[PDB]
Design an enzyme around this catalytic site. Structure first.
Site, PDB file in Angstrom:
ATOM      1  N   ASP A 150       2.894   4.662  -1.166  1.00 31.37           N
ATOM      2  CA  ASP A 150       1.743   3.812  -1.409  1.00 31.37           C
ATOM      3  C   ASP A 150       2.078   2.891  -2.570  1.00 31.37           C
ATOM      4  OD1 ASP A 150       1.753   5.736  -3.339  1.00 31.37           O
ATOM      5  OD2 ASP A 150      -0.348   6.309  -3.120  1.00 31.37           O
TER       6      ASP A 150
ATOM      7  N   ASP B 168       0.850   2.291  -5.643  1.00 32.40           N
ATOM      8  CA  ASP B 168       0.358   2.580  -6.980  1.00 32.40           C
ATOM      9  C   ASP B 168       1.471   2.641  -8.013  1.00 32.40           C
ATOM     10  OD1 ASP B 168       1.541   4.865  -6.069  1.00 32.40           O
ATOM     11  OD2 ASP B 168      -0.233   6.137  -6.250  1.00 32.40           O
TER      12      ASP B 168
ATOM     13  N   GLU C 292      -3.970   0.799   0.161  1.00 30.68           N
ATOM     14  CA  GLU C 292      -2.980   1.746  -0.343  1.00 30.68           C
ATOM     15  C   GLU C 292      -2.781   1.591  -1.848  1.00 30.68           C
ATOM     16  OE1 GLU C 292      -1.480   4.162   1.214  1.00 30.68           O
ATOM     17  OE2 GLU C 292      -1.649   3.746   3.359  1.00 30.68           O
ATOM     18  N   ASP C 293      -3.894   1.597  -2.575  1.00 36.69           N
ATOM     19  CA  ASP C 293      -3.951   1.563  -4.035  1.00 36.69           C
ATOM     20  C   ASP C 293      -3.570   0.220  -4.637  1.00 36.69           C
ATOM     21  OD1 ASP C 293      -4.838   4.151  -5.213  1.00 36.69           O
ATOM     22  OD2 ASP C 293      -3.150   4.940  -4.049  1.00 36.69           O
ATOM     23  N   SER C 294      -3.417  -0.826  -3.836  1.00 39.63           N
ATOM     24  CA  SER C 294      -3.214  -2.146  -4.407  1.00 39.63           C
ATOM     25  C   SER C 294      -4.541  -2.691  -4.927  1.00 39.63           C
ATOM     26  CB  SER C 294      -2.608  -3.092  -3.375  1.00 39.63           C
ATOM     27  OG  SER C 294      -1.296  -2.699  -3.029  1.00 39.63           O
TER      28      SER C 294
END
Ligand code: MG
Ligand code: ZN
Ligand code: ZN
Ligand code: ZN
Lengths: 57, 67, 56, 48, 263, 147, 45, 61, 49, 113
Positions: A32, A34, F1-3
């Site tokens: 992902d 992050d 996705e956490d962007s």
RNA sequence: UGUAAUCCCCUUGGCGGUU
């Protein structure tokens, strides 16, 4: 962990300093956005390029 | 460090209202009333003056490095 | 700007300048000399302008 | 031997008019000048 | 066919209602006013001395954000389109600032009123930093104590807000249509009743609420738009609106010329 | 996705903008009775094995001055260490290498403005310098934020 | 040849690469170089 | 002016002035250290003089 | 006087809590570089076990 | 480091044409127009103006990537009308609308001044 | 015609980031 963690993509040159992925491939990579980082390896021969494009694509 | 010139969100100039804001607070006005008197309607602008911490008053207390 | 010069003692000798009598009508005085006075440091222009030269 | 190398230069035309820089590469007719204003180095023709 | 109706008018903001125009035209006008109307802003800072506690690029960034009067910026030329070597008076405005604190006590505030226009285009009303009144000190730039001095020379150029937000003439453009949701363009989240859980729009009294027995009208389109244009003082509200319209016209005319010259 | 999506105009107006400082240290080492290192601007003639960077930003004392923009691999501290001379004294007109370069280059990936240069003496009485570099980092695609 | 500034009293002076590293009036052991005379320009962005 | 004249004028200013800001901190710190040394030695006579000197030097703004 | 001085300075500088020639088998990591990234980080570091 | 220059959003390179037109042969009387250094401001205006013309049967546009300042428009008219003429008519009509809007705003501002 | 430069430790230790 498994063989889908190394796959061969096609290069597209873009501005700014991050690798960019279609979000459907974030599942096999278990990735992902992050802060994850990923590795890129460049083939250096015609034989190796053919192997990447015909096997690991 | 020092009051920003423009509001981050919209871009209204809030850098010329710090002294007036402090003067209003000195007279006993509440923070909401002081911000209303300066014609800061949008809360995006209100957070700029409300949550600003003035650190330059602490940097200025150090003896200047030249003379 | 120039009191601390070694030659300033002879430079100021014989000069005519406006003086505040204090006791104010400004008047002219003739410099008979100068005498440094230790312990008589005084503000010359500002607080930092500590001077010990004196004009006779 | 490229006398303008490591010399302060100013840009007079193009999209960087009036920006101070220092010449870094002097191969020929295309000078590499680092800019003082942002942190980057750009090519530029000698005429500029 | 298009109509304009002004509700409130001021030097810094105008509240108007557009009608008989498409939603796309109103939105394009809003976008053009936000990011395509040219103004004048400081773009180069030459720091001859800076002994203040702020970094040089900190003060440069602060200076770039100070609004400057840009009334006659149309006559001015773009920096990249001026054939002059270096900068001339027809493509740049030179301002100079010099601040110093005297005495060994106290703190001196450096305001934008201290920016002095040195050179610029002849008889063009551009370059002066915007002041609310004649006694308004302006934007606080820095603070100084004893033996700290700030001496800089700034150059102002013409640009648009696409390149950097400091050239934007507007602050925030309120935009709104269909207060009573007759077009059903939005679906209202609710817990018990959607009518009493949602605040009324500030223009709800300008349109008749739908009748209880009224059926949905599928032939209707958004027709009346309420928009408020606020400016930073570099340009008046009417000037911003008119110049946005003119910029849109110029863009369309350029497209038309390209089409006609393509053949 | 956490962007996340950030407003470019807010970034232009100073949102989340920050300041970055990095300091470099160097000192003159003593290897013997009269073998000392020296802060100086090394020359292509009297020194050998120089760094590939540029030495033109150094002052007379081998230290860069504050306010000078620096890029990667530039030399901010000029230092040389003595080397026993070779037989080049045969026919070299004083242009023989007696010193070896030990200069400190700026990091390859970093650039900025020289902010402050400090010069003093260590506990042993030798020269000792510290150079602080300053740059501004503006948010961009890939920077990490958190609530 | 190159200016310097003391770290305590802020007194300007100069050194000849042979004097001890010291302020000439107050004897402080820490001194700073002075700013360059070159032009410094920023993009105001 | 010459270098020697500059040095002399520095010595003139330094012998004239009773004060320099940073150095007043150093004298007060040294006095405090001497005072604690006297306190640890149970010298009730020296400590009074040091306290008087500290009171005279202090009272900053 | 060098014995105590060097021993204390070495143990505080490197974090190995013991004699310099017995670095192995000594408790390491006792002394750490203070974290000065932000004020809260320093406060947290000063109260760590 | 890799951030592009901001003026590349609107400054057109000399070798890049502002407006490239290529026919779409899959359907009759259709063209594909590629606008350079443009965005939703011009595109949405043109699209919603052309959508109202009775002789335009398909009009659409898309911005391929937000990091590149260009958009591509697909236009497809009836048999009688050439698409480029329809595009020109749309441009002229929007220009007239903007002109009358400016005139009316000036009148209203003078009245309420 | 005066013609410009090519090179970098090692071992431990700590602290972190992504899982
Ligand atoms: Mg993750
Ligand atoms: Zn706001
Ligand atoms: Zn010009
Ligand atoms: Zn000193």
């Amino acid at each position: 962990l498994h063989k889908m963690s190394m796959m061969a993509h096609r290069v597209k040159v873009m501005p700014y300093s991050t690798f960019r992925l279609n979000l459907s491939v974030t599942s096999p990579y278990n990735a992902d956005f992050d802060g994850d980082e990923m590795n890129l390896h460049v083939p250096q021969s015609e034989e190796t390029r053919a192997e990447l494009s015909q096997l690991c694509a | 460090m020092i009051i920003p010139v423009r509001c981050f969100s919209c871009g209204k100039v809030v850098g010329d209202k710090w002294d007036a804001y402090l003067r209003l607070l000195e007279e006993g006005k509440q923070e909401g009333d002081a911000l209303d008197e300066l014609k800061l309607k949008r809360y995006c602008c209100r957070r700029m003056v409300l949550t600003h911490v003035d650190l330059i008053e602490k940097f200025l207390r150090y003896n200047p490095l030249e003379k | 700007k120039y009191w601390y010069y070694p030659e300033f003692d002879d430079v100021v000798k014989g000069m005519y300048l406006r003086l505040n009598t204090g006791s104010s009508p400004y008047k002219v005085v003739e410099v008979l000399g100068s005498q440094r006075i230790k312990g008589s440091a005084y503000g010359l222009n500002s607080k930092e302008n500590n001077c010990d030269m004196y004009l006779k | 031997r490229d006398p303008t190398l490591n010399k302060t230069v100013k840009i007079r035309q193009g999209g960087y008019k009036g920006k101070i820089g220092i010449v870094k590469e002097a191969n020929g007719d295309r000078f590499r000048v680092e800019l003082h204003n942002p942190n980057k180095t750009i090519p530029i023709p000698c005429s500029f | 066919e298009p109509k304009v109706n002004i509700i409130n008018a001021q030097d810094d903001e105008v509240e108007l209602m557009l009608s008989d125009v498409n939603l796309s035209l109103a939105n394009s006008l809003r976008r053009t006013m936000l990011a395509e109307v040219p103004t004048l802003a400081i773009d180069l800072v030459e720091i001859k001395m800076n002994t203040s506690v702020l970094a040089d690029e900190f003060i440069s960034h602060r200076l770039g954000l100070i609004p400057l009067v840009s009334e006659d910026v149309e006559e001015m030329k773009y920096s990249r389109d001026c054939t002059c070597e270096d900068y001339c008076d027809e493509c740049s405005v030179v301002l100079e600032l010099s601040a110093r604190h005297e005495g060994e006590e106290g703190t001196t505030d450096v305001y934008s009123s201290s920016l002095i226009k040195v050179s610029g285009p002849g008889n063009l009303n551009v370059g002066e930093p915007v002041r609310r009144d004649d006694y308004d000190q302006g934007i606080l730039l820095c603070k100084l104590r004893n033996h700290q001095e700030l001496n800089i020379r700034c150059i102002a150029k013409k640009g648009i807000a696409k390149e950097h937000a400091k050239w934007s003439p507007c602050s925030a453009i309120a935009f709104e249509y269909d207060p009573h949701n007759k077009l059903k363009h939005t679906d209202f989240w609710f817990e018990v009743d959607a009518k009493k859980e949602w605040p009324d729009s500030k223009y709800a009294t300008w349109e008749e609420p739908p009748k209880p027995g009224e059926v949905f009208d599928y032939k209707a389109k958004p027709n009346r738009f309420y928009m408020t244009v606020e400016t930073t003082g570099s340009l008046k509200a009417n000037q911003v609106f008119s110049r946005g319209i003119k910029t849109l016209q110029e863009k369309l005319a350029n497209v038309l010329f390209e089409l006609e010259n393509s053949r | 996705e956490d962007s996340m999506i950030m407003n470019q105009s807010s970034i232009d107006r100073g949102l989340f903008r920050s300041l970055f400082f990095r300091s470099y240290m160097d000192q003159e080492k003593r290897f013997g009775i009269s073998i000392v290192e020296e802060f100086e601007k090394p020359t292509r003639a009297t020194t050998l094995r120089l760094k590939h960077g540029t030495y033109e930003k150094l002052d007379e004392d081998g230290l860069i001055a504050p306010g000078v923009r620096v890029s990667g691999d530039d030399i901010i501290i000029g230092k040389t260490t003595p080397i026993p001379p070779d037989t080049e004294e045969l026919g070299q007109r004083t242009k023989y290498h007696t010193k070896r370069d030990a200069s400190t280059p700026l990091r390859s990936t970093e650039n900025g403005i020289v902010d402050q240069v400090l010069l003093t003496t260590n506990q042993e009485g030798l020269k000792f310098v510290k150079v602080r570099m300053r740059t501004t980092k503006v948010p961009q695609i890939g920077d990490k934020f958190a609530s | 040849g190159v200016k310097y500034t003391c770290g305590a009293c802020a007194h300007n002076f100069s050194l000849n690469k042979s004097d001890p590293v010291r302020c000439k009036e107050c004897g402080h052991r820490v001194i700073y170089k002075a700013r360059t005379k070159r032009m410094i320009q920023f993009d105001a962005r | 002016l010459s270098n020697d004249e500059v040095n002399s004028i520095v010595k003139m200013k330094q012998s004239l002035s009773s004060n320099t800001g940073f150095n007043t901190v150093l004298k007060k710190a040294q006095l405090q250290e001497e005072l604690e040394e006297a306190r640890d030695a149970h010298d009730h006579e020296r400590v009074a003089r040091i306290e008087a000197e500290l009171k005279s030097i202090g009272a900053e703004s | 006087s060098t014995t105590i001085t060097s021993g204390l300075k070495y143990s505080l500088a490197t974090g190995n809590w013991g004699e310099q020639k017995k670095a192995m088998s000594s408790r390491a990591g006792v002394s750490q570089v203070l974290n000065r990234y932000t004020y809260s980080s320093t406060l947290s570091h000063l109260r760590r076990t | 480091m890799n951030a592009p220059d901001r003026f590349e959003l609107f400054i057109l390179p000399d070798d890049v044409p502002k407006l490239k037109i290529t026919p779409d042969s899959r359907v009759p009387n259709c063209i594909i127009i590629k606008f350079e250094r443009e965005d939703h401001t011009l595109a949405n205006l043109l699209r919603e103006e052309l959508a109202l013309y009775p002789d335009v049967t398909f009009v659409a546009y898309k911005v391929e990537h937000p990091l590149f300042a260009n958009f591509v428009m697909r236009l497809q008219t009836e048999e009688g009308t050439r698409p480029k003429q329809a595009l020109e008519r749309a441009c002229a009509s929007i220009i007239n609308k903007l002109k009358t809007l400016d005139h009316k705003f000036n009148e209203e501002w003078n009245i309420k001044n």
